[PDB]
């Protein structure tokens, strides 16, 4: 009757949690593999957790589940695995990687802290409630126990459950600004996200991921009018519309002119920058506001848990990176702080396993 | 209606956010001044944060708040503002400090980490929404800039909103257990909670803030089988009830001996050595669940949020602390990392600031 009773499906064509509608909470767990891992390892791993993923998002308790009871209410979990290289590696099936499973090219902007980049296996973990999302990410990391260990956490956040934005729009952002207007629909153009035909053949249903942690330096985007932080974006603040129209939803228009001639949306504005120059160069975005602890001597530390799906990272994803690189105004107040790209397995049916059809050879 | 809508005054007798019912997010920001503060500096504080909290909980943009749409949700926000001995040294009121204002003594068990102890001043931040939460501290710590720096922020969870426990219970902890049952009532123990006509005068209407930071050793506690784990408490981890019972609420039977002669709840078992020994040898307990990104060796950072509240620390706390010191069988399965003590001066009306009756002289 409530947002804790939803269950959402574990099985199908995809894995949860990627056209999924976006729940409150995320915690992406990035793993290394052991020194010992072999092809069997991985397989073992993948079989343990397939369990544990099929009983936690029903609202069972997991195969290596202490607290059944922190297991009971399931909030619309979802565990999404994605394969680095290092899984391929170490599984013995570096011929099957696809070309695009690399880190991304370094960018000038890039401020690339290790410690948030990389990992040989991830388990994008989601849900409505925080009590659930540690339990899940408690018992998945216990049963990974000598086949793999944590490298990183990133935590994230949106509204809760039952709670809407300020005029229905889409999410906040830490900047204040309205994240997630023009994205890819997987309803219209499912070959832009889903790998279907191609080569390699275990990613029938699967994807690739993109995790960029972005930090969001607030206390120089303070100094900014609002004029120019919606200048900076080329949207306003309050409704989310272009500086072009009057709603959210409002088709930009990139060719308007002010009296003096100049474009009204700047040249260098996020939104033109970021905007497909081809059909291809788009990608969902799935982002989380991350607030941690602050460091040493600073007010906040906030930013943007920018999650990216997309068929190819390298003729989707990255080409639009290079040209924010290349020019973005919100370059200025903004910085990447991690980076990690994972090969995302299709779905499974009762009786597989998730990324069955890369480890059979 | 949704639970964003819901606005808790911030006037009254009493600060809110001690009896308020407990929302599902929290972060404590404890501050230290600047060396150079005075009396004055201590005033403009609590009177510009006194404007931020009577707007922020009403869903009103804040003094220093250039997000003013991050703060349209109020989303039941509260504001609890409690002093440490620090606050009133630089103020030059020292001679107005209440005996029971200083660190708790020392404990055998204690592992204090000094980056989660002491603190001149503390904003215990209260919840719905996350994004809401973020925003009140961005906006409070901004508004210290040059009077007082972070020192450090805690940050914790219960379920979402319109999520309750398994069976309707309390609050369920990252050990997996029930947590909240045997709590002080300030409806029918008032006296015990709320500081009246004693000296010193300016806390009328105020009360006493304990905040240890206590980690939960959960790869040794999974060691244990749930018989275990439930003689270490005295209660059910499925009802909650005690050994002796058969429901959460009813009353433990400490007499109660098995058919060997063995006490039913251990000598040593936690609500044994807990229990009040004297009527004013309670609190209220308003705890949250700590869940952190993992240091580099370890599965899980979990722990409690240990907050309590009660009209005088030494007389009231500490002597239930040093009972458990003395013997306790969870103290093998947990350990203190953080400890503050602070006094929380009484609520005021439209037109007040907080802590005014202090600063007074
Ligand atoms: C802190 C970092 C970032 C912030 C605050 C941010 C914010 C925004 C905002 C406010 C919008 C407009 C609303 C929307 O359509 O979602 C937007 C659009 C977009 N952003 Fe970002 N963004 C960030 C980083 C990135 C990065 C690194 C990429 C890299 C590819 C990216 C790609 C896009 C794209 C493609 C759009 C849609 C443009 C359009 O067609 O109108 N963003 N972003
Ligand atoms: C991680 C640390 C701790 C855990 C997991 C924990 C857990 C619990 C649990 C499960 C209960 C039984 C349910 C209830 O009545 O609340 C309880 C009761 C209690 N705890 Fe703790 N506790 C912890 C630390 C402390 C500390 C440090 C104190 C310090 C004074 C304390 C004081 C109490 C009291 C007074 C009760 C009620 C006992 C009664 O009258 O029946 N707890 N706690």
Redesign the pocket.
């Known amino acids: 009757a409530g947002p804790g009773d939803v269950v959402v499906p574990c099985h199908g064509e995809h894995q949860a949690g990627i056209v999924t509608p976006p729940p409150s909470f995320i915690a992406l767990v990035a793993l290394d593999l052991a020194s010992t891992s072999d092809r069997a390892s991985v397989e073992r791993l993948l079989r343990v957790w397939t369990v544990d993923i099929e009983r936690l998002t029903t609202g069972r308790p997991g195969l290596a589940d202490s607290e059944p009871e922190l297991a009971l209410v399931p909030a619309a979990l979802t565990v999404t695995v994605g394969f680095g290289p290092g899984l391929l590696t170490a599984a013995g099936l570096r011929h099957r990687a696809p070309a695009w499973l690399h880190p991304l090219p370094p960018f000038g902007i890039d401020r690339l802290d290790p410690a948030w980049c990389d990992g040989d296996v991830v388990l994008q973990v989601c849900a409505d409630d925080r009590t659930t999302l540690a339990h899940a990410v408690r018992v998945l990391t216990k049963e990974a126990q000598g086949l793999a260990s944590v490298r990183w956490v990133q935590r994230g956040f949106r509204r809760s459950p039952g709670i809407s934005e300020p005029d229905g729009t889409s999410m906040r952002?830490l900047?204040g600004?309205?994240?997630?207007?023009?994205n890819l629909d997987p309803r219209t153009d499912p070959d832009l996200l889903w790998h279907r035909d191609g080569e390699p053949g275990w990613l029938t249903g699967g994807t690739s991921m993109v995790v960029?942690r972005?930090a969001?330096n607030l206390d120089t985007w303070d100094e900014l009018s609002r004029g120019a932080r919606e200048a900076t974006?080329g949207?306003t603040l309050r409704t989310g519309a272009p500086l072009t129209g009057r709603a959210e939803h409002d088709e930009?228009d990139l060719e308007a002119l002010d009296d003096h001639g100049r474009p009204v949306i700047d040249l260098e504005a996020?939104?033109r920058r970021?905007?497909?120059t081809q059909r291809e160069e788009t990608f969902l975005?799935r982002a989380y506001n991350y607030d941690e602890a602050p460091p040493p001597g600073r007010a906040s530390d906030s930013?943007?848990l920018?999650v990216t799906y997309q068929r190819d990272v390298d003729a989707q994803?990255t080409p639009?990176?290079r040209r924010?690189d290349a020019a973005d105004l919100?370059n200025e107040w903004?910085f990447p702080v991690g980076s990690a790209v994972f090969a995302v397995p299709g779905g499974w049916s009762a009786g597989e396993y998730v990324g069955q059809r890369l480890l059979e050879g």
């Open positions: 952002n900047m600004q309205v994240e997630g207007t023009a960029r972005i969001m974006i949207r930009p996020h939104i970021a905007r497909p975005r930013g943007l920018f994803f639009v990176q924010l919100l903004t």
